[PDB]
Write a protein that binds this ligand. Structure first.
Ligand code: UPG
Ligand code: UPG
Ligand code: MN
Ligand code: MN
Lengths: 282, 282
């Protein structure tokens, strides 16, 4: 009933059916992590039993953690890849977008799956539920999750999409950190910086491929780190810079400033520079 | 230290000085009200002692309340004006913007002051603190308040202004419902619909007059009705439609849709139609 292929109830496929449907295609899972020692182990544990089966490869993309994220991830049996190790020839920029872009060179799966590592008790069927439409359907090359926080999504992204890309008004969680896509697509797209990356991939895929190439799946309920408003303001600023750039609208490039007392002025970084398609780095 | 004339500490002027400084100029106060029976009395009480003094006129602009807002406001000694009564020749549209636009025909003050009527225990010095820069300074024609909720402001408006009108990045509460301005300015500007009006007046004033004509004043702490996220999403959508329109960016005109389960789809209204300057209705 939506213009977007949408699985509403717990998808029917089993691990075995999906594993059969792979048909030579490989699957890589990437957990980007910046200081998530408190949750990373449960997130890895919820996925590592699929390894050597449905999943051929699982990595943690360590985006410069200074806490005990790496040693706990290792202790959970996960391969940990720094931004440096993933693509040593290129100096590292900050932001999640960078990490996701770099994870493309540290993985070799025909299908790449992303899962945020700050999720509190993720369901072990997240990955299957996410690769469902890619494996069985035809035409699908991007799968976003949806779920029943949510402030930047409900106040910035979905209303802006309503404003500038109404065709995507039916995407329920455009910023979801849990999503999957073909390597062919991901290596063809540029990667927006910082927190601009999701909204960047959505608009670019659609612009390049239309809604038929996009699916979304219900994963139930999502719980994650509740961040302070100033950080969300910064994130919201970058989401806006990337969305505006994809719509052909010039963004000033000026970072958001916040005040909190004569007074204490702080400016957050914002970037208008995308990383190119990983294809060009062959 | 900001490019915007900013009074940070409780402004020094007294009621008497300000009353002296009027010099023939009149002051109208407008409280727009849509179903605020629980708070309207305290808001009127905090202002009515200035009437026949500093304030020459106080009205409640009733924007179609079906609760006991009108009878309580009357019982507090306030003149209550319906949208119909304010400008009977023109059929009524919904939204706050409409109410504020209409209040221009029901008032006759050289200076018009706006105060939201959902404020919990407002300080009786709000109006003086707001008319301070208009009465004493020269050049000022718009005064916004600022204060230590705030989600649409911190995630949508200030970051968008950072994106498209960085000169206003130093405006602390662009959506504040408490603000004052000259009749000359207000009757010269168009009024954006619904919740687009504040952000519409800010961008238009600045575009027409630059920062020097704009001031902002600290009123301390603001407390008001906490609204559910779907309503804030709708509000945020209209703020975006108006901001995009003022920046020369085409808005789709498609209202934001929300889902909440096979499912229950609702679309909120959005309007791309401004009311013209009240001047043209002479
Ligand atoms: O520089 C960074 C920043 C974040 N992350 C990781 O990215 C994930 C998401 O970051 P988070 O701070 O939890 O973002 P959210 O506020 O939850 O943002 C939501 O909305 C964002 C905008 O699209 C998405 O990027 C997020 O994935 C999504 O969870 C977390 O695992 C982080 O550890 C990094 O690896 N590197
Ligand atoms: O159709 C309407 C809607 C609202 N109001 C009144 O306007 C005021 C503000 O509305 P509110 O629902 O409290 O808005 P907020 O979510 O608090 O929005 C904040 O941000 C908005 C966007 O600029 C401003 O319009 C508001 O004044 C400001 O308080 C309240 O007194 C309402 O009674 C009306 O008179 N008519
Ligand atoms: Mn998170
Ligand atoms: Mn309010």
């Amino acid at each position: 009933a939506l213009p977007l292929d949408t699985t509403w109830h717990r998808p029917g496929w089993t691990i075995g059916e999906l594993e059969a449907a792979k048909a030579g295609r490989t699957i890589s899972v990437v957990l980007p992590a910046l200081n998530e020692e408190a949750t990373i182990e449960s997130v890895i544990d919820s996925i590592s039993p699929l390894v050597d089966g449905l999943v051929d490869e699982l990595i943690v993309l360590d985006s410069g953690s200074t806490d005990d994220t790496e040693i706990r991830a290792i202790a959970s049996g996960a391969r940990v890849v720094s931004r440096e190790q993933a693509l040593p020839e290129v100096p590292v920029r900050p932001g999640k977008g960078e990490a996701l872009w770099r994870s493309l060179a540290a993985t070799s799966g025909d299908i790449v799956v992303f899962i945020d590592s700050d999720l509190i008790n993720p369901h072990p069927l997240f990955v299957p539920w996410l690769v469902g439409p890619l494996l069985t359907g035809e035409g699908i090359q991007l799968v976003k999750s949806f779920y029943r926080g949510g402030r930047v999504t409900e106040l910035v992204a979905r209303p802006l999409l309503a404003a500038l890309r109404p065709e995507l008004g039916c995407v329920l969680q455009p910023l979801s950190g849990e999503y999957a896509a073909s390597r062919e697509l991901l290596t063809s797209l540029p990667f927006a910086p910082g927190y601009g990356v999701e909204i960047g991939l959505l608009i670019d895929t659609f612009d390049r491929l239309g809604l038929d190439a996009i699916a979304q799946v219900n994963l139930g309920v999502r719980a994650h780190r509740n961040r302070p408003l100033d950080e969300l303001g910064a994130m919201s600023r970058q989401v806006i810079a990337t969305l505006l750039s994809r719509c052909g609208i010039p963004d000033s490039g000026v970072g958001l400033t916040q005040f909190l007392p004569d007074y204490t002025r702080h400016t957050w970084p914002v970037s208008l520079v995308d990383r190119p398609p990983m294809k060009v780095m062959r």
